[PDB]
Design a protein around this ligand. Sequence first.
Ligand SMILES: N=C(N)c1ccc(OCCCCCOc2ccc(C(=N)N)cc2)cc1
Ligand SMILES: N=C(N)c1ccc(OCCCCCOc2ccc(C(=N)N)cc2)cc1
Ligand SMILES: N=C(N)c1ccc(OCCCCCOc2ccc(C(=N)N)cc2)cc1
Ligand SMILES: N=C(N)c1ccc(OCCCCCOc2ccc(C(=N)N)cc2)cc1
Ligand SMILES: [Ca+2]
Ligand SMILES: [Ca+2]
Ligand SMILES: [Ca+2]
Ligand SMILES: [Ca+2]
Ligand SMILES: [Zn+2]
Ligand SMILES: [Zn+2]
Lengths: 91, 91
Amino acid sequence: MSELEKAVVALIDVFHQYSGREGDKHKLKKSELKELINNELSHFLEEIKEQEVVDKVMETLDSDGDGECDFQEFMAFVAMITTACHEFFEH
Amino acid sequence: MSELEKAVVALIDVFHQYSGREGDKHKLKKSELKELINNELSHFLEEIKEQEVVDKVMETLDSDGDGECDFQEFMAFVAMITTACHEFFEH
Ligand SMILES: N=C(N)c1ccc(OCCCCCOc2ccc(C(=N)N)cc2)cc1
Ligand SMILES: N=C(N)c1ccc(OCCCCCOc2ccc(C(=N)N)cc2)cc1
Ligand SMILES: N=C(N)c1ccc(OCCCCCOc2ccc(C(=N)N)cc2)cc1
Ligand SMILES: N=C(N)c1ccc(OCCCCCOc2ccc(C(=N)N)cc2)cc1
Ligand SMILES: [Ca+2]
Ligand SMILES: [Ca+2]
Ligand SMILES: [Ca+2]
Ligand SMILES: [Ca+2]
Ligand SMILES: [Zn+2]
Ligand SMILES: [Zn+2]
């Protein structure tokens, strides 16, 4: 598999790693999203310690108002992170 | 870096790998997009041999009508591929 192909599978695997822990096994509830950010985005994003802060991130990500981040919503989150990283390192 | 963090950087690196070859160094023209698909998505997508087929893929990806795929448009392409892969392997 190419690097791109392995990257794609890694996105799928991290989503399932955290989504399957509680409740709906195919969505990230706020608790699962906080764990994902703190354990997997520790170089890209500030650690979340407050309920207020994960509330706000979930508000941004949650396009259908169910209080959770589904796989489509997670893909939008990945696009946001990737865009911000790409731009951080360039002029 | 986590797996997710390395995956994010891999998306950036494959985009730059192909975008920088010709013309606008920050967009994939059809020629660059064809090369990316054929060399980097050979397990996920059918090889492109015809101008018609890359025309069609570029039509799908090109949201601002400039005939090219910018980084935002490429992120949408990555979301499409990842979604299709995730769903292929599940019930
Ligand atoms: N010392 C580093 N940060 C760094 C190290 C290696 C690297 O290998 C290719 C990745 C793309 C290289 C140029 O574009 C970016 C954009 C964003 C990030 C990032 N989100 N960290 C990293 C690189 C890149 C950056
Ligand atoms: N050898 C080592 N130990 C080492 C080498 C490079 C390194 O680099 C740290 C992070 C570099 C890239 C990630 O940093 C950001 C920060 C903010 C944003 C943002 N704008 N959201 C995106 C990415 C760290 C450790
Ligand atoms: N034999 C395989 N295909 C395969 C091998 C390893 C693997 O490691 C974790 C990746 C996620 C595992 C379960 O979800 C998916 C969804 C899509 C793909 C794919 N796009 N190929 C692969 C896996 C996964 C699949
Ligand atoms: N040991 C080996 N040599 C080997 C092991 C597994 C393998 O698996 C091939 C591809 C598996 C996952 C990629 O296959 C697709 C197909 C269609 C879609 C789609 N719906 N677009 C998405 C993914 C290949 C070789
Ligand atoms: Ca869950
Ligand atoms: Ca939702
Ligand atoms: Ca180009
Ligand atoms: Ca465009
Ligand atoms: Zn760039
Ligand atoms: Zn799944």
